[PDB]
Design a protein around this ligand. Sequence first.
Ligand code: ZN
Ligand code: ZN
Lengths: 148, 76, 69
Amino acid sequence: SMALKRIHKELNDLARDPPAQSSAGPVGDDMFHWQATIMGPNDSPYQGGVFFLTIHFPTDYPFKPPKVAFTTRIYHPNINSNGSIKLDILRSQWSPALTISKVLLSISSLLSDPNPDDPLVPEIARIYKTDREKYNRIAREWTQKYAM
Amino acid sequence: MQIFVKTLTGKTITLEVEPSDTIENVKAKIQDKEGIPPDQQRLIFAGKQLEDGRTLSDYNIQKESTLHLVLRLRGG
Amino acid sequence: VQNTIERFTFPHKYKKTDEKCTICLSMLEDGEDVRRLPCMHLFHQLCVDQWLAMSKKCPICRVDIETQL
Ligand SMILES: [Zn+2]
Ligand SMILES: [Zn+2]
């Protein structure tokens, strides 16, 4: 209810000032469920891809973080095959001053600069560390299959 | 050679090591001095986490270097 | 607890450049119950007090409300 007012405010912000490189809006008539797209950033092995996100807002948002998950497959140490994201501002580092806009920037920044030391899928992190160009090649390959 | 290990509190210890010593050897040297098990030790130098099978020279840790010691968690 | 908050922050009624509460996203207006943190950041009493019940950090800079140096 207060969460609804604040979700409405954010949407107005997206209206008045449309972000570059991302899109998000409600799913149907449900303001507590959103959908979004991220561009793969140009530095990454995901350049050229667009990744799809599903977003749920809890009833006491913004005091508790939204649930965010990829619905596009991606080769990434912190994003597993369910689309779950290991990102600090999404659990312990969440703040009621953060917005969905900044969450997307972060996820995008997470794509450009992975955190292999606290990985969600161990095997990818080991390849990321041991063999970078192995990692970037298969990331690019997954980008071509799932993200085009 | 001489190096220092530092914790989040500022607490500083000093080790004698060799450039060919491995991160496992270094962690074992920290166990001796501080009673912390190698399994609980996470070493970080110049932003990078140090891996158990590599040596100090592999990261070009040189004389009077400071490593950082934190808790190795399960993750992730 | 609530009076840990009162001992380390400044509640007051707003006198009005615009300023926005980063929690609710609405502008502060004359007479509203607001509160300032040792970081100098300002929110609506209701907005920030809800977070301070869960955390002793500033939503913006994240500095602890009991920081001193
Ligand atoms: Zn407010
Ligand atoms: Zn602050």
